[PDB]
Every structure is written in C-alpha cells, then in structure tokens.
Design a protein around this ligand. Structure first.
Ligand SMILES: *[C@@H]1O[C@H](CO)[C@@H](O[C@@H]2O[C@H](CO)[C@@H](O[C@@H]3O[C@H](CO[C@H]4O[C@H](CO)[C@@H](O)[C@H](O)[C@@H]4O)[C@@H](O)[C@H](O[C@H]4O[C@H](CO)[C@@H](O)[C@H](O)[C@@H]4O)[C@@H]3O)[C@H](O)[C@H]2NC(C)=O)[C@H](O)[C@H]1NC(C)=O
Ligand SMILES: *[C@@H]1O[C@H](CO)[C@@H](O[C@@H]2O[C@H](CO)[C@@H](O[C@@H]3O[C@H](CO[C@H]4O[C@H](CO)[C@@H](O)[C@H](O)[C@@H]4O)[C@@H](O)[C@H](O[C@H]4O[C@H](CO)[C@@H](O)[C@H](O)[C@@H]4O)[C@@H]3O)[C@H](O)[C@H]2NC(C)=O)[C@H](O)[C@H]1NC(C)=O
Ligand SMILES: *[C@@H]1O[C@H](CO)[C@@H](O[C@@H]2O[C@H](CO)[C@@H](O)[C@H](O)[C@H]2NC(C)=O)[C@H](O)[C@H]1NC(C)=O
Ligand SMILES: *[C@@H]1O[C@H](CO)[C@@H](O[C@@H]2O[C@H](CO)[C@@H](O)[C@H](O)[C@H]2NC(C)=O)[C@H](O)[C@H]1NC(C)=O
Ligand SMILES: *[C@@H]1O[C@H](CO)[C@@H](O)[C@H](O)[C@H]1NC(C)=O
Ligand SMILES: *[C@@H]1O[C@H](CO)[C@@H](O)[C@H](O)[C@H]1NC(C)=O
Ligand SMILES: [Ca+2]
Ligand SMILES: [Ca+2]
Ligand SMILES: [Cl-]
Ligand SMILES: [Cl-]
Lengths: 422, 422
C-alpha cells in the first residue's frame, strides 16, 4: 500500500529484495509420532522444590479439549501465563524417537529453530532438515550428554573453514536445568566462520536452506534417583511436552523477490522479479539470456538481462565464451533472425538485401531487396550497408538505372551508356 | 623486289593500294560469232584513191596460218608495220551482229575500250558490259549514223547528273573515215560530270565496273555507190576486220590491294590487305568488325579494324548504334567472353569473381574467384573490382579471414571477433 517497490530503485533500477523474516512454523500443522490422550490416561508432573516430591497428576484426554494436548498447540500463538502444549504419549520406553516434523513446502533459508518445553528438556535430541520436500533428511544440530555414544559425534566439535557445514553436538541445553519453561534454540549460523559475509558464502547459503524440519527426542532426563538404572520400565512422568515451536527464517528467492505467495494448487512460491523465474527465482526468464543467472547481493541486484535482437528474433541463447570475451557484459545470441536480417543481434541485412536507412534497424522491413537493374548493373547482389549495385561504365543510380552525365543511352543490353566523344 | 609495301606507310600504317593499270584484254582469248576461212574463201579490199577502184583480193584460209585471221590476232602484241587481224566471215547479210566477247573473270574497273580496224569502221556498233560473269549484259556505248533508228537512242544525248550512268550514242567514229587503220575509243568517263572526283563517286564506280565486255557490229559502211539500196545481196568486201582490241583498266579491289593474282582453280582475285576479304576486298575479315567496311580513298585507307576483347573472345559483332554513338570510332562487341569475364570487351569480371590486379586484363586468369571466408564474411559475393568481401564486425582481410586489431577471436561461427573492452 504505502510501501514502494522494494525490488526496484526510486529510479526504477533493480535492487535486491528479500521476503520478510518469519517464524515459518506459525499456524502450521506439525506432524508428530506420539501424542497423549488416546486412550485417555493419567500423567504426573514431578516437582523438585527443597527435598519434597509433589507428584501432581492430571488426565490427558484427547477427546476433551480442556484436557487435550494436540500437536496444534505447538504453533498456536503462544501467550505465556496461559500456555498450551502438545505432549507425547506417556511411559516412553527406551530407546525411542518422538518426532515433530514441520513441512514448509518451499525452500526457506532458516536462521534458527527453537522450542519451549512444558516438561523438562530431553537429555538427548536432534534436529534435522530436508532440502528435498522430505525425501531425504540431514542432521542440523545435536543435543546430548553423550554425544559420542548416543549420536556417534564428537562432543562440541570445533567448526573449521574445512567443514563449516557440520552438524555439531553439545550439552548446552543441560546448563541450569529447570523442569519447566526450558528453552532450546539452534541458530544455524552461530559459530560458523563465514557467517559475517553470508551474503557471499554459498556454503552457508546451502547449509541454511531447507524445505522441512524434524526434531527428534531420544532420551528423557532420568529422575526418581535412578539409583538402580535397572529400572527399565517407565512411569507416568515419562513424557515430553512442548508449548511452542518456532522456525525462524525467510523464504528462499535469491534476492529476486519481495515475498512468496500461494499459487493455483495452494503452493507457496516466490513472486519472482528481475526477469527471473523458477520457484526460487533460480533461473532467468525466457529471452533474457544476456548474461548468466546470479543471486542478488547488497550491492549488485544481478537482474536477468534481455538479449537484443532488434525485434527480429523470438528466441535467444547465452554464450559464455562471448560473455567472457566481452568482459562479462553480454553473451546473448539471437536465433533465426526473421525479416531477412542476419548476425548476432539480427543487426544487418542478409546478402540479397540491404539496409533501408531512414527506417530504423528495429523496423520490420529495415532490410530492402537488391533490385539491381538487369541491364544497368554488372551483377545481382548489392552492397548490404549502402544498397549500391555494381554499375556498368556510364551508369549511375543506386540500382544502376540511368546513364551518367557525359553519357548517352544506347539500346544495347550489353553497353547501355556511351560517352559523348570529343 | 625493290618496291616497298604499297598498302602500308613507311611507318607500317595503312594506305590505299590499287592494282596496276593494264590492258586487261592483252593475251586473252576473245570469243567471236564469226571468223573467215572455214571454208577457205576469197575476200577483196576495195581502194578509194582518186577515181579508181583497186579491188585487191586475197584468200582467207583458216587452215593456212599465213592466211588465217583468227580471233587470237585481236590481242596478240600489236606491231604496226606488221599488223595482224581477225576478220569476220564475208558476205554479211543485213541485219547482223558480229560479236566479240572478252571475259575477264573478275570485276575490273575500266577506263576505256578501244579498237583498231583493218577494214573500215562499222557504220553501226555497240559496246556492252557484264557485271555478273556474263549472265547479263548492259549497254556501255553506241556508235551509229542513225542512233534513233538503229539502237532506238537519242543521238548524242547530253549527260546529266540525273543519269550520268547513261549509255549514249554518237557518230563521232564517222569523222574523217579512212578505210584502214580506223581507231575507235570509248572512254568510260569522258563527259561525265562527276569524273573529276571519281574517288568519291559510287555511281561512276559502278558504271566503270565490269567482268566481261562485248562489242557488236551491226552495219557495214555502204559502198559501191549503193545508188540502188535495192542491192540486198552482199559481196566479198562485206566483212569487218580488226588488228587490235584493248580494254584499259585495273582490277577492282576497292583500294585494299596492290595486285590481283591467280589462285587454286586458276581464278583471278585481289590479294586483299587492310584486314579485308572477298574477291574485291568488299568486306572485312573475321574478328575485324570494329567499324563498317569502307572503300579506301586517297586520304583515308579505311582498313578493317580488329575489335578488342582482351583475348577473351573468339567472335565479334559490329553494332552501328554503338559506332554512331561513339562518334563513328568503334562499334565492335565481343561474344561469349570466356575466362569468367564479362562486358563489351570482356573487360571486367563476372559476378562470382574479381579482378586479379598485377595480372593484366588480357591474362587468362585475370579474374579470380571470390573465396570469401565462410565465418568471417557476411556474404559469398565480393567486390568485382577490388576482391573485397563483405566483412563482419571485427573482421578484416580481403576474404574477411582475420580479426582486426582491438578484437579477439571467438570460436563462434556467428560472431567470431569480439572487441577488447575498456
Ligand atoms: C474424555 O472426554 C470425553 C468428552 O467429554 C468424555 O466422553 C463422554 O462423551 C459423551 C458424549 O456423547 C458424554 O455422554 C453424556 O452422558 C450421557 C449418559 O447417558 C444418558 O444419555 C442420554 C442423553 O442424551 C439420555 O437420553 C439417556 O437416558 C442416558 O441416561 C450419554 O449417553 C450422552 O451421550 C449422548 O451423545 C450422543 C452424541 O455424542 C447422542 O447422539 C446420544 O443421545 C447420547 O445420549 C451424554 O452426552 C459423556 O458425558 C462424556 N463423559 C464425561 C463428560 O465424563 C469422556 O468421559 C472423557 N473420558 C474420561 C476417561 O474422562
Ligand atoms: C588451205 O591451207 C591448207 C594448208 O596448206 C591446204 O591444205 C592442204 O594440206 C595438205 C596437208 O596434208 C597438203 O597435202 C600435200 O599434198 C599431197 C599430194 O598427194 C601426195 O601425198 C603424199 C605425200 O605425203 C604422196 O605419198 C602421194 O603419192 C600423193 O601423190 C598430200 O597427199 C599430202 O598430204 C599428206 O599429209 C597427211 C597428214 O596431213 C599424211 O598423213 C599423208 O601421207 C598425206 O600424204 C601433202 O601434205 C596440201 O599441200 C595442202 N594444200 C596446199 C598447200 O595447197 C589447202 O590447200 C588450203 N586450201 C586452199 C583452198 O588453198
Ligand atoms: C524415528 O522415527 C523417524 C521417522 O520415521 C525415523 O526417520 C528416519 O531417520 C533416519 C535417521 O535420521 C533416516 O536415515 C531416515 O531417512 C528416516 N526415515 C524416514 C522414513 O523418515 C527415525 O529413523 C526413527 N529413529 C530411529 C532411531 O530409528
Ligand atoms: C547478236 O548476238 C548476241 C550474242 O548471242 C546476242 O546477245 C543478246 O543481246 C541482247 C541485246 O543486247 C541481250 O538482251 C541478250 O542478253 C543477249 N543474249 C545472249 C545469249 O548473250 C544479240 O541479241 C544478237 N543481236 C541481235 C540483234 O539479236
Ligand atoms: C486463558 O485465560 C485464562 C487465564 O486465567 C486461562 O485460565 C484460560 O484457560 C485461557 N483461555 C483460553 C486458552 O481460551
Ligand atoms: C613481220 O615481219 C615482216 C616485215 O616485212 C613481215 O613481212 C612478216 O610477215 C612478219 N612476221 C611475223 C608476223 O612473224
Ligand atoms: Ca502453545
Ligand atoms: Ca593484232
Ligand atoms: Cl528465449
Ligand atoms: Cl568474328
């Protein structure tokens, strides 16, 4: 409304535009492996304060909305002082994997994934992404007190330039453990050495990109003393619960759009600009092949450029050697010049025709036929630039259609203009 | 031998030449209708002196050479004081036609026909020519005392410009009649008003031309008184006799030869020069059609001119309009230029080729192909004068086979030379 076009300058010149930052999980329906309440079943909160165990107990009943704890409560608006949470099934045996999967449907770039717990935090969990609509999954971040044993990872691996795309493991989640309200937050870029100029890092750009997100919990904080780790069987306090799940980032458009939006088929997609196309504006638009696709940046917008064919070609092709040689200015090449033109830009007239000046090069019929005079000219093909036909001695005119001054017209087809003698 | 070429200058330049003047009848065998001596038979000379008739009589015997009087004696060398003469049969009735026919076999121009009589001269005779080898005959001159009656001609008709080709009749032969040694002489040109510049009179030129010559005698000078013209029957003095017949002129060559001469088949013909041909040098030689045939004159030789085709044509054609327009200099036109040349003189290179300078225009291969570079040039056909092909941007060379300074070679066939940018 009162927002001017972000994809272009105040002079109409292109500039980079990126969709707004969002929690991309807000309002979304998250898929989970486990939820309490079917069949209804009692659970207990355990309480630590002093040296006393208040085992407070309530009923998870999925058919009772006052007592239901559905995945929906993960991405509803979170009001503290009145929290809602999803809560897993109870009595979790070990080993296990209680998964939450957020499917975005469209590549985003993600700056963080975060959760607020109603229960205590897991001893162990992981976060994973899919960059391909959920056919494959890839570790994003690990949390655990036995990184090695549980996930086979070094604890707290330093991140090198050599692999800053590396999913590390840590126990930082354990620092100062409350049993409620526990926050975990994975910033995709914390501690990655190229973070400072993300804009020019393609490796981080890949790292942070995903279409879906999975968090899996695989071990509960052991309580009840666990003096005998013998107690394999579980209890009604053996569940996870979460009040809010967020995935912070923005829609992936390579700096060539100001928003994503819902098409026909209800699918999210970039509103591509800069004469770009594809769901992420990952490629140039037709006939806009003057130079290579580039992702925009702070300084350069890198719009896709229309190749020039002076209105004599439908299609266009990019040629890198030409680009290279031009000093990376232009490499487009026209195909099937159409109005008896020829050349790279359909910018000159095929032999057999010539350049009708006073009409401009863009003009349908900027190329005129050689209509060389049968008897006055010495051949059929005229000068493509100038129109001039090859004239016999004594002849003039563009088409050789006249004797010159000093000459007299014969009725010989071979020699039609003879010089006045003296 | 010690005679330099008469048909050319002392600088080798053409000049008019004409065969020598001859009596063309000398030595020739003349055909006659009547000769005495078969069978042998007595004849009489009648003699006038005082008032006495010496009827001297001798025998014409054709088998006796001391007494034979054959046509041969008409053109044998005449020695006066020892004359020889042919003599007709005797007893000539009236009317009659005793004819002598000289066949030259070749057109001559004739300045006179002359005869010396042994008998008295005829009262009436005529001379005729053939301009066509004796198929037709045409009056040349008439002699008679009754021009009107005998030849149906006005006596002594004045000659007008209006017909100076007119055969007149006269009685001049009768002036001071001896009975022996009588001379008659017809000069073809006496009294013809154009005679003075014959050289430029085509009508006299035609008048004097012939191939054969006939003299016919048709009435004898009446003697014996002829008091009674009743005497129809004739007598042994009623014959003609002639010692010498001459036909003065020269062989017809239109000023383009210094002699006639006897070819294969024994026929007389001009030794034509000035690049002329035909029995009278009446036409130009092959490939020598630059200008029209002309008869030579005192000032201008009017040689036939070779047309110029710079050694690229076998045949040649004359064109009068071109001649006219050139100011009557030249009108020749070459046919089937042969080494990929074209034009009037095969003097320029067909489209598809061009003029290889440093080789001369006469050179087989003075025309070189356009070998325009497939990728460097913008079309196949090059400049016929210069060789230059139509070059793409950045290309140079006659064949467009190189990038210019400032340009770099691509491996695109469309645009093979790109400018170094700045
Ligand atoms: C988890 O939470 C759910 C939701 O509260 C609880 O499930 C029960 O849900 C049913 C809903 O049907 C509630 O049943 C109620 O009690 C009646 C007792 O019997 C009388 O019913 C009819 C009244 O309509 C009389 O005509 C008849 O004479 C009986 O004496 C039920 O029968 C009623 O159900 C009625 O609902 C259906 C449609 O659902 C109608 O078509 C029928 O007519 C039917 O009568 C009535 O709704 C029940 O109260 C809920 N239980 C509660 C609140 O305790 C589970 O109980 C809860 N689970 C646990 C373990 O807490
Ligand atoms: C017009 O002019 C001609 C030419 O003079 C005259 O014709 C005569 O021509 C013949 C030529 O043969 C002359 O004849 C001569 O007189 C001979 C007389 O008879 C004797 O002949 C042979 C000699 O060879 C004897 O053996 C024999 O016993 C005879 O007694 C002729 O016979 C001769 O002719 C011989 O010639 C031929 C070839 O021609 C031979 O093969 C024969 O053997 C043959 O004998 C001999 O030549 C004759 O003299 C001529 N007459 C003359 C001079 O008066 C005409 O007379 C003349 N006409 C007129 C009217 O005047
Ligand atoms: C817990 O359940 C999830 C959801 O099905 C399992 O997902 C697999 O996870 C492994 C390891 O990350 C991947 O290699 C597979 O691609 C996932 N499969 C599917 C179908 O999504 C996960 O394996 C389970 N946990 C354990 C320990 O087995
Ligand atoms: C005398 O004889 C000559 C020779 O045959 C005749 O020639 C003809 O002459 C006439 C008149 O000149 C021509 O028209 C003919 O062409 C000639 N004919 C031939 C065959 O040559 C001539 O006619 C004779 N004289 C007379 C009076 O008849
Ligand atoms: C939020 O408001 C009150 C605060 O006391 C709470 O008890 C109630 O259950 C909540 N209402 C909702 C979530 O609709
Ligand atoms: C010519 O010479 C003499 C001269 O007296 C003459 O009588 C003779 O017949 C002639 N001889 C010839 C024509 O052979
Ligand atoms: Ca909530
Ligand atoms: Ca003689
Ligand atoms: Cl295109
Ligand atoms: Cl020729």
């Amino acid at each position: 409304a009162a927002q001017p076009d972000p994809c272009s300058d105040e002079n109409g010149h292109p500039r980079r535009c990126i969709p707004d930052f969002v929690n991309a999980a807000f309002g979304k329906d998250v898929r989970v492996s486990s939820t309490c309440g079917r069949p209804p079943a009692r659970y207990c909160v355990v309480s630590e304060r002093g040296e006393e165990r208040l085992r407070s107990c309530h009923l998870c009943n999925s058919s009772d909305p006052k007592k239901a704890h559905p995945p929906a409560f993960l991405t509803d608006l979170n009001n503290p002082h009145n929290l809602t949470c999803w809560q897993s099934e109870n009595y979790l045996q070990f080993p296990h994997n209680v998964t939450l999967t957020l499917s975005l449907g469209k590549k985003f770039e993600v700056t963080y994934v975060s959760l607020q717990f109603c229960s205590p935090r897991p001893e162990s969990m992981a976060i994973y992404k899919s960059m391909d609509y959920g056919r494959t999954w890839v570790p994003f971040q690990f949390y655990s007190t036995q990184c090695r044993k549980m996930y086979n990872r070094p604890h707290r691996a330093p991140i090198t330039k050599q692999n800053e795309q590396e999913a590390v493991c840590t126990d930082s989640h354990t620092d100062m453990r409350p049993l409620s309200g526990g926050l975990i937050a994975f910033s995709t870029l914390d501690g990655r050495p190229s973070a400072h100029d993300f804009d020019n890092s393609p490796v981080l750009q890949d790292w942070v990109t995903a279409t879906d997100i999975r968090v899996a919990f695989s071990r509960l904080h052991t309580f009840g003393d666990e003096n005998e780790d013998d107690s394999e069987l579980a209890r009604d306090s053996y569940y996870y619960a979460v009040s809010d799940l967020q995935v912070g980032g923005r829609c992936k458009c390579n700096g060539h759009a100001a928003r994503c939006v819902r098409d026909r088929d209800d699918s999210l997609v970039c509103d591509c600009r800069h004469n770009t196309a594809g769901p992420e504006c990952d490629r140039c638009k037709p006939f806009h092949y003057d130079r290579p696709w580039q992702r925009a940046t702070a300084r350069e917008a890198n719009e896709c450029v229309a190749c020039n064919c002076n209105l004599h070609a439908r299609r266009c092709r990019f040629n890198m050697e030409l680009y290279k040689l031009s000093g990376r200015k232009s490499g487009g090449v026209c195909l099937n010049c159409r109005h008896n033109t020829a050349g790279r830009h359909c910018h000159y007239c095929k032999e057999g025709f010539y350049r009708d000046m006073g009409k401009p090069i863009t003009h349908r019929k900027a190329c005129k036929a050689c209509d060389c005079h049968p008897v006055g000219a010495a051949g059929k093909t005229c000068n493509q630039t100038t129109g001039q036909c090859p004239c016999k001695d004594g002849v003039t005119g563009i088409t050789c259609n006249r004797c010159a001054k000093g000459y007299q017209q014969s009725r010989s087809p071979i020699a039609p203009c003879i010089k006045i003698p003296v």
